[PDB]
Scaffold this active site. Structure first.
Site, PDB file in Angstrom:
ATOM      1  N   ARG A  75       4.942   8.737  -1.151  1.00  0.00           N
ATOM      2  CA  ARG A  75       4.961   9.495  -2.408  1.00  0.00           C
ATOM      3  C   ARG A  75       4.543  10.982  -2.228  1.00  0.00           C
ATOM      4  NH1 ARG A  75       6.667   5.232  -2.396  1.00  0.00           N
ATOM      5  NH2 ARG A  75       7.091   3.837  -4.253  1.00  0.00           N
TER       6      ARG A  75
ATOM      7  N   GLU B 142       7.585  12.619  -1.113  1.00  0.00           N
ATOM      8  CA  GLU B 142       8.545  12.752  -2.205  1.00  0.00           C
ATOM      9  C   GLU B 142       8.154  13.916  -3.101  1.00  0.00           C
ATOM     10  OE1 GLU B 142      10.708   9.407  -4.126  1.00  0.00           O
ATOM     11  OE2 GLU B 142       9.404   9.960  -5.864  1.00  0.00           O
TER      12      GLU B 142
ATOM     13  N   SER C  41      -2.097  28.866   2.882  1.00  0.00           N
ATOM     14  CA  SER C  41      -2.523  28.325   4.166  1.00  0.00           C
ATOM     15  C   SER C  41      -2.794  26.849   4.168  1.00  0.00           C
ATOM     16  CB  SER C  41      -3.866  29.041   4.541  1.00  0.00           C
ATOM     17  OG  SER C  41      -4.185  28.760   5.894  1.00  0.00           O
TER      18      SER C  41
HETATM   19 CL   LIG Z   1       6.208   6.679  -7.756  1.00  0.00          CL
HETATM   20 CL   LIG Z   2       7.518   2.873  -7.155  1.00  0.00          CL
HETATM   21 CL   LIG Z   3      -1.468  28.177   7.698  1.00  0.00          CL
END
Ligand SMILES: [Cl-]
Ligand SMILES: [Cl-]
Ligand SMILES: [Cl-]
Ligand SMILES: [Cl-]
Ligand SMILES: [Cl-]
Ligand SMILES: [Cl-]
Ligand SMILES: [Cl-]
Ligand SMILES: [Cl-]
Ligand SMILES: [Cl-]
Ligand SMILES: [Cl-]
Lengths: 156, 156, 156, 156, 156, 156, 156, 156, 156, 156
Positions: free
Chosen positions: D96, D99, D122
């Protein structure tokens, strides 16, 4: 206290040991799960490294398969999940489920959006099961039911 | 005479044109499939380049979306299937089905062999459907049914 | 009727045209989202092909950017998401967020399991924001808040 | 004298040994980091091979986990960082966060350049933390704060 | 207001147009950067899609190359950086710099940690230059200087 | 007689053993190379598996790290070079040198062709060094010099 | 002033147009190179995007193939070299030289180190030619001679 | 009865054992191949896992290197060929041969088709040798001769 | 004079144009190959960009498909072969032949070495054909016959 | 009760032990399958990890190879199939079968659709055999027969 893994190889090595014990004892997945109170798909996935058993289940299955204490402990750890060796399966049985996604993945997206809305069908608030049904034209069919919660994408 | 394709981009570019026309007409996949005699999942997959429509169905959907004759003809060609751009989906909706395979692929293999035998669940003698139902705990769930023939692997 | 896309390049080419229009007007993403009722991260993500705008927001941003009707309609379609060209970013600004995952990904997994349990922090019941703050040592810092629902993985 | 590693497998093997000790002792990452003067996210990342502990913290955690002297020395080495096995996580919890970058990575870019200018946030002058917050609709949310210095790109 | 790109192909297409104009005019990179106040390596990188030019330098190079107004605008946008087509260069000239990392990358890590500490040498607070030096055994040598700020990694 | 390797893992394994010995003795790479007559970048690279030491230098370093005779022999073998595990570094310190190529690689090609001609800057008739210099704005900079022979590409 | 490319597709598209013209005129590579003073392998490589032709040769082959002025100019630019579409060839004729490397690559390394010492056989100070020889068992053989300068790796 | 392998790691592990023995004895490939009546490139490639030795040659090299009986038998087994760890070499010595293909692969294809016809130059009915000769301009050159049978592609 | 291609996209674009002409004319591959004196598998492969047609066959098929003169010339060029888009097929019909190699590839190797010896079964001195046979248990089967010369690997 | 594997390396390590046993006994695959009542291709695939043996055949081949009980039990387990190490073979003998797919894969698709219809030729209801025959021009040929059931794709 919950405990979690970061390298799948430890649980996957344990899965190979579990399968040899299982075959030496000529056991089925159905009989290993029976008595745990947990669904066969869940218990099987835990033996194969992809779910964590609760302690009582891990002791139950551990006795049935003659596992040692470190292996019973390892079955209770939260796994680093991912059962496919290198992204696409090579095994024909597993590959056909990947092919279902190659043929119907965009259709599944489209129909989910039309029936539900923007968002996903969950793979976490989720269960699956596998049933065998007679085919009227001869032979047998599998009906595999994927049952996941809809989680919407809304604007913020 | 049956006609087939060898480059998916032709039918995928046709799908992009279809989807724009569908959106300009404010149409649903359910209404596009209405009157064809064919399931919404199959018709939608054909629109998205992953199945071939029989001529009558192609004419019916072609009138609904105002397609030209070459597009109606292309809908009847057997496609070069494979809807995922580069092996693993990026889109969250599609990815959760891939994640189902990463978490339960080996379980599906194991339970198919135990309930049926060596061999596969077909992705060819196969149908799928998506239903929307309420969740007893609140909200909505998708029940997606994969229904494939068992094909055995036997010694020769 | 909701409408959805299956090839990201349609919306990504729209994003490039939006950016050129935006630059010719000397517009900011903050001013584009002003008036919509919606957070600047969500509106900006829709412009860049990763979210769908409601119709009124689509028409509003379309007026600010001089978009045609097909473009306004495209911003309302649910996208085929995935902004990274080829899995790992090449751009330094985006790559630092990937580097955070390479350094802290297993720590995030371990501390989510300890604090919440087995399961996930959702990327769908989720909001993100970027805030600029002063660095007390001199200069400026970004505070990026990832705010997702915990979804448990439980036995069944 | 500072000491550094060039192959991640030495510290990742140590990490697996540490996790097995931690599980046998039924310890939490919060308790391991107690007494060190360092944040749980930092110490956990060091245990998992992604940061170096100062000598006194290495000895403290070493005694808690019953580590041998070579393991206590290895925790003090600067690691060859990179926790993801093969570029993209397979684990759902870790995926996740990947994603989030696939959906919002270009939006992070765009808003960082609008708010700060050309350059980067950074991943080195950087810290993160994970907090648990109740959700008003039921359940719990994680609030994961990424806090990095802006470093400008200027002409030369 | 600063403007940024999210697809590298817009600026890389621009760079091909710039190179054709440069060749037809028989110009050098040294002459193009003359008068801008900026180092030839920085101005050249901007023409090739990897840096943004301040507006006065964009206008100056635009006049030299007979660029149109949208191209002069594009040169001022912050690019989506990443000049290598597919991760590893194929061209021998570019490849030798990648080979220097395959041979000496761990040595660079080790000597940076010994001389400076944990952390990085920046690619952002960073200048490079290429100089041509006679070789005393005959021929010519390139002395390429990479000059980056050390940014430390410290506990939190 | 010269001896050469074909599996990098033998020398990289030796490197990990060397680094553990080195850390136990609290040695620096500058002090290991002291007395060899050879530059610290070259000696360090040999320790890390990417160069061969002449026999006298191999015995000199082997004394200091307390290496056995098999290890001292291995340091004299010509290595199968390549220090990056899987093409792109994951480690932040090494990654920034790769990012220098993603930003400037086409610039280095263009300026090498302008200043020298068609052909390459060698990575074999080549030396590198790393120097620490104070930054006038505060802090410290590394000045890494890459010094390679120009080898022309001529028609034949 | 020397001019160089950064995108191979411009010269590879030119190569495709050159080959069409060559086929329409029924010309051989031998006759296109005859009269230029340059070896057939070098001229052919230039036509195919992998070398630069001097101006006189570019005009000579451009008259023979009826190229336009932009094409004759492009033939003189220093190319972004790399003729293989995606790292490993698909074409059988090309693939056999890759398979030579898979079978004999370590043997070439071992014999180069034995005969010459540490270092490389150059691909820059280098020529190749292809000759047809009768096979005494019947048919024909190709003798392809790769002729490269040895460049030593020496300690510094 | 001929015996074959299916996992390259068995013979590549033998090769590493052979090279350790060879180095301890300070032997050259030329001397190992001496007496065998086989070309040094063929014998060397068998030692390194890429060819099978006839039984008399196997016995004779096995004596020189003091191999055990499982190793003299293994040298006679047909290998699972492929000497490059992961498709493209990292070692500079090996990489230059790959670069010859990236630069001249399409030229080799085009010149083979013009001099011989459609088809291939074989990598099986094939011999290679490496010779060291002086360079007329100073230094040394390798002349590597790839000698393969032409096998035509004709209609059927 | 023979003519060859170096980029597959020219002939694959041609194939798409051929396929559309074929479908508009409702022709079969059997009928297109009729009259050519060549096997249907060979002619079809040429139309799909993987073989070259002799000039009389190219003119014959060109008239049946109403191709222009440049297309008829392209069909005579020796192709840059390789019909799979990205190494592993996505199409189910094509993928099953790849799956045959994943299941039986090492058996093919073993039985070829057993029956013939070290060496290969050619894919150039080679023909294939596809035959339809009734299955006695009902339905139809394809018998695909791959018929290649054995080429030995011999010591030199 | 049927038993199955999920990691190919357990059976592939067994294959390597079977191959060393076979070589010490100077056994052929034809001899090992003799008396089993099963085709040599099927039994050889089982030994190499790609099929399961019935119990009586497992005991029989186990007697011939001097296998222990666990190995005889492993040969009866349904394998995780996939014999190619990393998707594309490196070994020349294996690679030529892959090359047959790169040259004829689209022709196989086209001809299967023309002869049979939309759908697949099965790799599961499937047999293969390898026959050695004389080449009437001199030498020997392999005739490899792939014999699979046609499974149609129909509308639902
Ligand atoms: Cl999710
Ligand atoms: Cl999920
Ligand atoms: Cl960095
Ligand atoms: Cl199937
Ligand atoms: Cl940086
Ligand atoms: Cl070089
Ligand atoms: Cl070189
Ligand atoms: Cl060959
Ligand atoms: Cl062949
Ligand atoms: Cl099948």
């Amino acid at each position: 206290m919950i405990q979690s893994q970061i390298n799948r190889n430890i649980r996957l090595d344990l899965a190979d040991a579990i399968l040899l014990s299982k075959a030496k004892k000529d056991l089925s997945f159905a009989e290993i799960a029976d008595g745990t109170g947990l669904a066969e798909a869940f218990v099987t996935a835990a033996l194969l490294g992809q779910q964590a058993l609760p302690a009582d289940a891990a002791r139950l299955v551990g006795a049935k398969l003659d596992l040692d204490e470190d292996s019973i402990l390892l079955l209770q750890m939260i796994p680093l999940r991912g059962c496919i060796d290198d992204r696409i399966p090579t095994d024909p049985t597993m590959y056909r489920f990947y092919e279902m996604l190659q043929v119907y993945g965009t259709t599944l997206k489209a129909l989910v959006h039309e029936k539900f809305g923007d968002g996903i069908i969950s793979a976490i608030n989720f269960k699956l099961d596998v049933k065998k049904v007679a085919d009227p034209e001869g032979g047998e069919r599998a009906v595999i039911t994927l049952d996941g919660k809809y989680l919407p994408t809304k604007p913020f």
